[model samples]
Target chain A: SDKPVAHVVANPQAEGQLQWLNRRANALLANGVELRDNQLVVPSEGLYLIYSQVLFKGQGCPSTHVLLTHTISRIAVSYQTKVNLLSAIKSPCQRETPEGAEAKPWYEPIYLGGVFQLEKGDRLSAEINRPDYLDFAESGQVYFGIIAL
Target chain B: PSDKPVAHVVANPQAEGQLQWLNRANALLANGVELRDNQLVVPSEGLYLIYSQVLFKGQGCPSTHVLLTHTISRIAVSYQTKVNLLSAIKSPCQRETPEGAEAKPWYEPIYLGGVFQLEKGDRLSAEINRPDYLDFAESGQVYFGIIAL
Candidate 1:
């Protein structure tokens, strides 16, 4: 029961990289991992189950703009290079048209999770193309977490 | 049996039906994890992290708007009824081609993940509203799985 595990919720004030709240009401039990800025710092080296979710909402078509992206990237201690571990994309609507029937309210949810090796200093984080449309009104709407195996 | 029980399966190629899943490149390794009838069958009572992802692509405008949805549901042994754990919905995802292009392909991805308390004999699976739009080329495009913590 002591295995390193932490679940963090989204911080609506985030600008681009999508910040997190590691020590809040819904995120009180955060353990092992460290939250620095927007990335999660690994507490130990192991094959950890990493996951993230983002619920995106928009009133019109321009908000989604054909290809909205959600990506989870890594900064490893062993390899200094940054790599995108997981990514998901969604289009809320088609490209613009003068007729404008396609322009309407919409919401899209993207969830990504996998098992990957991580070093003690490896850092994991999430990024999105359209943060303005990201919904953080509910803590469960957006979140990130990791558990060591 | 490994201390950390986990199960992950990717999308089956050319899969038909609203519920599409099969394991090839991805596998489930655990003491009490089994993929039965396209759902993850659990063997113990505990908190598990579950997730699902779906990628959509096709000729956009010609098709009726893709009222696309990616849902993760559960069937509990005690309840004897299917209950939804998480759901994502997006609409009007019409693929639009540029004026010059003959037939450009379009794509969109949906992901949903979270941790929940589950009991033995609990079953989980992914269900989509639109299956025709799912992309089967990449193994990562579609997958549903769970991990015990």
Candidate 2:
């Protein structure tokens, strides 16, 4: 019962490094769990459950060959590389649109998380391949979180 | 004591309806938790975070259009049947490559997660819409996990 529990909503306005925010309008961040530069900083050395979801929207039907091949990864001193815990690869080039309906932007979500061993200072963030199609939408539609166990 | 209950398991090919997972190694660990016949049994009452992901893969084109869904359901001690906690539906069709070239072997990943206040004996499990399209060629690509908060 000593570990930290944190959850953040997506800040879609930041087109730079996929960012998250903590507030009552969205969610809250517990003490010891910190958010910096779009990464959640782990406090204690133990196993933690991390999760995230991103909505990808295509402006056109069969927008392009590339969709979203994204993953929720973490970085720590033990592993400087982007160690992927969960990943999602989605293609927006499908969905021919119902024969009777008009074309609309395709919205797809890739959300996943898992329990993983983490050390103190382990930073968690998301990596996206096709970053252009990210749909911010409502704050509730996209999110990332961590719960220490 | 680090007595938090948690578990993570990778996906394994199984029959239609409900999916199965591999239970070997620490890949499947349930400290202060219990598992039976693919159902993750709760150890004690608390706020539990649960998640699951599925990779649907295939080649060539397809005429059948249906939503490939990933669902994490829980059967409460009060309720006799499963009430869905989290779910994500996706289009699992192959994408058009080279700007309208032959359909390539493509895949889509769907993920879903949430936190729920549960009882001591609540049972949790996962299901997929297209078992024929389930992808188990790699680890970390498909998984179902839970952690007590």
Candidate 3:
């Protein structure tokens, strides 16, 4: 049996948001701490797993949601399946984009920058792989793919 | 330590139809049924979570509504995160009537157990965690006959 483990580390750039919060909210009002980037670490040949819930504050600053490109190198993980990849399409019959609908431009699809190595038994969550990629870049049509050999 | 006589819970064939209909109409999908087999094994007893949701015909059950299921034995071995009980299994999910009927081989249960897990009283929702692995008995399978619970 593998030990339950998780590594909680903050993203440096996200510190800007933290600094802003410190200055804006008094010590008593500020219950939330700076955002941290969590990665689960396992032994060299072990599997790293993750099960998480991300809560976005509903109010203040209008909340900015940005899509993060995930490049998984080594180790595989499976996420709880309920994660949402796309929310706009509620009905199955609805096409990704209806015909004669407003024409929108999107980015050219390409392999993400950098190469990540994944050993056997390694897995990545399909939901986190591409959260909101379509909304960020002008190109709404980007091919999303994942490989697990 | 010989594990306590753990009662593993699998979909009860006897209670399936009632549970299925109940799940279709309400929020939580299933009523807890203990597997009577003396040597039953539970994926995990900590909190054998259950969630339920209904899938409309045509639209593959919304990825949003899938739930997760696990066992006590695997979980005790710290396999909770390792074994995916139902994540990627595709529902014999098919399109609604006209299009679904005409499309290629015709709609069959993509993942019967996957759909069954979405019943009310299950104590969870499909949104919380999606099923990573699905199990099906060859003799019986679910098919979409009509809409509404």
Candidate 4:
């Protein structure tokens, strides 16, 4: 039996503007989930668990405070609109070091996931506040997926 | 439909101020999946996706630095051991405000989730380094669940 399960891992080569992650280096499409224009298109109207993880890293502490926000939103075509469902926002303050000292790198990974009742035509995607800080590696550390329950 | 393998468990209110298995607020249990000793026991499994989230808050900044760690681990009886499936570690440096200055309350939610290939007798559980910081309200903010694929 074919089950509705699909996952798309991040591609380090795929950089630049922020958009829907339909295709990348190592993306898997299985069963009934469809990837269209960077969104996971639903095949049936049922309860599905949608999830995403974004790993962010920076070279050094540039500012005293930085805000990192990750969002998992859906676009319902039947209603001809999109709705922002879940979002995780975090702001971390950097520690002050001695002047001209060695700068240490900092990194953070934001994970957002949950189950929701989705319609047949619903589409899902992951968004971040600072796309440039995204560490889109080939590993499964940064990825997105949806599973029909 | 009754044979489907799925389960969702929310944080037990009694677990507050302690690090332990959330034994209350459970949903969905098909096939042989079970909630025993605060862990989800697999039932004739192949591959499964496990997810968990913990919400943390504090009234004031007790320390200048804080370390938050959330982990989703699995115990494979056949392998005679346990493995860390996924983990999210965050070290946020709190702002060092001046004396007599008002320190507002701060909150943060740590979410950890991923897919793993499991065995029939595998057992999975969610944990946090600072359980006392967790807010174990009856809300869906803190929860753990699994779906067999």
Best by lDDT: 1
For model 2, residues B1-149, the per-residue Cα lDDT tens digits are 45688888876645443368766655655676676778888888877777777888877446545457677777886766777666555654433234456657768787777665668888888878787777877767888888877
Quote model 4's iRMS: 3.8
Which regions of candidate 1 fall more than 4 Å away from where they truly are? A4-50, A62-103, A108-132, A136-141, B1-4, B14-18, B23-26, B80-83, B89-101, B137-140
Interface alpha-carbon RMSD, every candidate: 3.5, 4.4, 16.5, 3.8
Pick the winner on DockQ between candidates 3 and 4.
4
Full-model lDDT, candidate 3: 0.23
For every candidate, the chain B TM-score is 0.85, 0.84, 0.23, 0.85
True contacts kept of 4: 0.13
Write the candidate numbers in order of decreasing lDDT: 1, 2, 4, 3
From the highest DockQ down, the ranking of the candidates is 1, 4, 2, 3
Model 4, residue B139: displacement in angstroms? 4.9
Off by over 4 Å in 2: A1-51, A56-105, A112-149, B13-18, B94-103
Local accuracy of candidate 4 as per-residue lDDT tens digits, B36-117: 8778899875657778878887666553456677777778868657666666665454334456878676777777776665
Angstrom error of the Cα, residue A137, model 3: value is: 21
Instruction: Point to the candidate with the largest DockQ.
Output: 1
| Tens digits of per-residue lDDT for model 1, B98-148 | 556676566767778877667899888788777777676865667888888
What RMSD does model 4 have? Answer: 5.5
Worst 10 residues of 2 chain A by lDDT: A96-105
